[PDB]
Amino acid sequence: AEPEHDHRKRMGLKMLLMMGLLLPLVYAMKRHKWSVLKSRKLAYRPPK
Amino acid sequence: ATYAQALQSVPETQVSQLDNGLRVASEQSSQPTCTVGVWIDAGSRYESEKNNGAGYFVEHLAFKGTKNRPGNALEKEVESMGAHLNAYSTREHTAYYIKALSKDLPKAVELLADIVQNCSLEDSQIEKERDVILQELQENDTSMRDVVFNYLHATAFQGTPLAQSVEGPSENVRKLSRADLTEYLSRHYKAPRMVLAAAGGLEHRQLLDLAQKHFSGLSGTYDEDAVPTLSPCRFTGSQICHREDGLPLAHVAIAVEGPGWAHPDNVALQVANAIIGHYDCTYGGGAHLSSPLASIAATNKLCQSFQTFNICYADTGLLGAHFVCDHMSIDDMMFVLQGQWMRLCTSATESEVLRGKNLLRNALVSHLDGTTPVCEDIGRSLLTYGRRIPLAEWESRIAEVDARVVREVCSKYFYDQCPAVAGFGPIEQLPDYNRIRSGMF
Numbered sequence: 200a201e202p203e204h205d206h207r208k209r210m211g212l213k214m215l216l217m218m219g220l221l222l223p224l225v226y227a228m229k230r231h232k233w234s235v236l237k238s239r240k241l242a243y244r245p246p247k
Numbered sequence: 248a249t250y251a252q253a254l255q256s257v258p259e260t261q262v263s264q265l266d267n268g269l270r271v272a273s274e275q276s277s278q279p280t281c282t283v284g285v286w287i288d289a290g291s292r293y294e295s296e297k298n299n300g301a302g303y304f305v306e307h308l309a310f311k312g313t314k315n316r317p318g319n320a321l322e323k324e325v326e327s328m329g330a331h332l333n334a335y336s337t338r339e340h341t342a343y344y345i346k347a348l349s350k351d352l353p354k355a356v357e358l359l360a361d362i363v364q365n366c367s368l369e370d371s372q373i374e375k376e377r378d379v380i381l382q383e384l385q386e387n388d389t390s391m392r393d394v395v396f397n398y399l400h401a402t403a404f405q406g407t408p409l410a411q412s413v414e415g416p417s418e419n420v421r422k423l424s425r426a427d428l429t430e431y432l433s434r435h436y437k438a439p440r441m442v443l444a445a446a447g448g449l450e451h452r453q454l455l456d457l458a459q460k461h462f463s464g465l466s467g468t469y470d471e472d473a474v475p476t477l478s479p480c481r482f483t484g485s486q487i488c489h490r491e492d493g494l495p496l497a498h499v500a501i502a503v504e505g506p507g508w509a510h511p512d513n514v515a516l517q518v519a520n521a522i523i524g525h526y527d528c529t530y531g532g533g534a535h536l537s538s539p540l541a542s543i544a545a546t547n548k549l550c551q552s553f554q555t556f557n558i559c560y561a562d563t564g565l566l567g568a569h570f571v572c573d574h575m576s577i578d579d580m581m582f583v584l585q586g587q588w589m590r591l592c593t594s595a596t597e598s599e600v601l602r603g604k605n606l607l608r609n610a611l612v613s614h615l616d617g618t619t620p621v622c623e624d625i626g627r628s629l630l631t632y633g634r635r636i637p638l639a640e641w642e643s644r645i646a647e648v649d650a651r652v653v654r655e656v657c658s659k660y661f662y663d664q665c666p667a668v669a670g671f672g673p674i675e676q677l678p679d680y681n682r683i684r685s686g687m688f
């Protein structure tokens with residue numbers, strides 16, 4: 200019923216290993232770019 | 248003569264030094280007038296948060312009377328001989344100079360000596376200047392250019408003495424006391440920190456004797472625990488955006504960290520900055536200007552003006568540009584400007600670098616035109632390089648620059664480096680820092 204059985208699982212292992220690599224890296228890229236906004240500070244100086 | 252022989256005919260600047268450490272330097276010419284002054288290694292970089300603005304306050308008091316010439320007596324004397332007395336303070340240097348007839352050099356030196364050593368600092372005068380300074384702070388607030396440049400330093404050198412303005416915060420102006428000032432003075436106005444410079448129709452020997460006569464009493468010791476030394480100032484890739492849509496034009500200043508006064512790289516950097524150049528709506532060249540940034544800006548009406556700059560401090564500096572433009576032109580201006588820095592880093596051509604070299608040659612010589620510009624060059628050079636760099640040396644340094652040197656030096660300071668950005672006005676269109684940073688490579 201599922202001759203592709205063994206191959207999908209082998210591919211699955213590789214997919215997991217690749218995502219284990221890529222996800223943290225892309226997440227680090229996300230945090231890197233967003234840090235500019237995450238640490239920005241604002242000040243309101245209206246004339247009085 | 249050729250430009251080369253003319254270079255070797257400039258009188259060599261003569262330098263001497265008194266026992267107390269005071270350096271005396273001069274360049275003699277046959278001008279019937281001269282400029283003589285005192286340059287000092289003192290400025291806001293030497294100030295702390297408590298006394299920031301002290302030096303500027305002193306500048307306000309310097310000509311208000313001395314123990315020997317109270318009140319307007321100093322003033323009357325300068326004016327009656329037709330002389331001019333001026334001064335200026337920056338983050339690292341302070342200068343007091345006089346333009347006078349060459350025959351009046353003795354009185355000029357006496358007055359400077361008197362000013363630098365016997366300033367009255369009368370309590371009532373201090374209170375008057377307090378209000379003058381506050382009003383000057385208000386006026387400076389209306390100068391978008393001065394504001395943006397103070398902002399650039401505030402963010403680029405945040406957390407260091409170089410982040411401070413020369414004038415200081417208004418609360419310091421309201422609280423600085425005579426004690427604070429006399430203290431500042433005893434600490435910074437010492438002979439080893441000063442240079443008596445003069446240019447014009449006078450001889451070094453005469454200047455030296457006048458210096459021995461009038462400046463010998465100047466302290467040259469201080470001690471050991473109170474010798475204001477400078478710590479390096481950290482540069483920070485950052486951005487400060489003061490949005491004010493009520494202002495008609497936006498002002499933007501952007502810069503990467505420069506090498507500092509003493510570095511040989513400043514010559515190549517000056518060549519590169521000359522290539523990009525400067526511009527404003529009144530320039531006659533327009534679409535034909537050699538600088539790509541200048542012609543693009545002129546034909547497409549991208550800005551009212553722009554100027555590249557290389558602001559140097561002891562061990563660091565601000566290398567970049569400033570532009571003034573309409574609220575819808577900021578992104579375009581930043582795009583073209585950064586594209587030009589990148590083109591220089593990777594593809595500067597021999598012909599444009601030669602143009603840059605010629606622009607620099609002309610700027611150097613045309614700047615040293617008159618006794619005041621020359622005297623200032625002497626004073627400042629002695630404080631920064633410790634010697635007067637002759638034109639023949641400048642030529643040699645400029646001559647050594649070629650397209651290869653420009654690409655390498657520009658790559659060193661501009662390529663993939665974090666800039667400091669300051670914006671003021673209708674800046675909704677000023678690019679996000681990440682986008683500006685990506686523009687650096």
Ligand SMILES: CCCCCCO[C@@H]1O[C@H](CO)[C@@H](O)[C@H](O)[C@H]1O
Pocket residue numbers: 511636637639640641643644645647
């Ligand atoms: C990039 C070149 C760095 C070294 C340039 C030195 O240049 C030399 O300096 C001497 C002293 O100022 C001059 O007398 C001499 O004429 C000049 O050629």
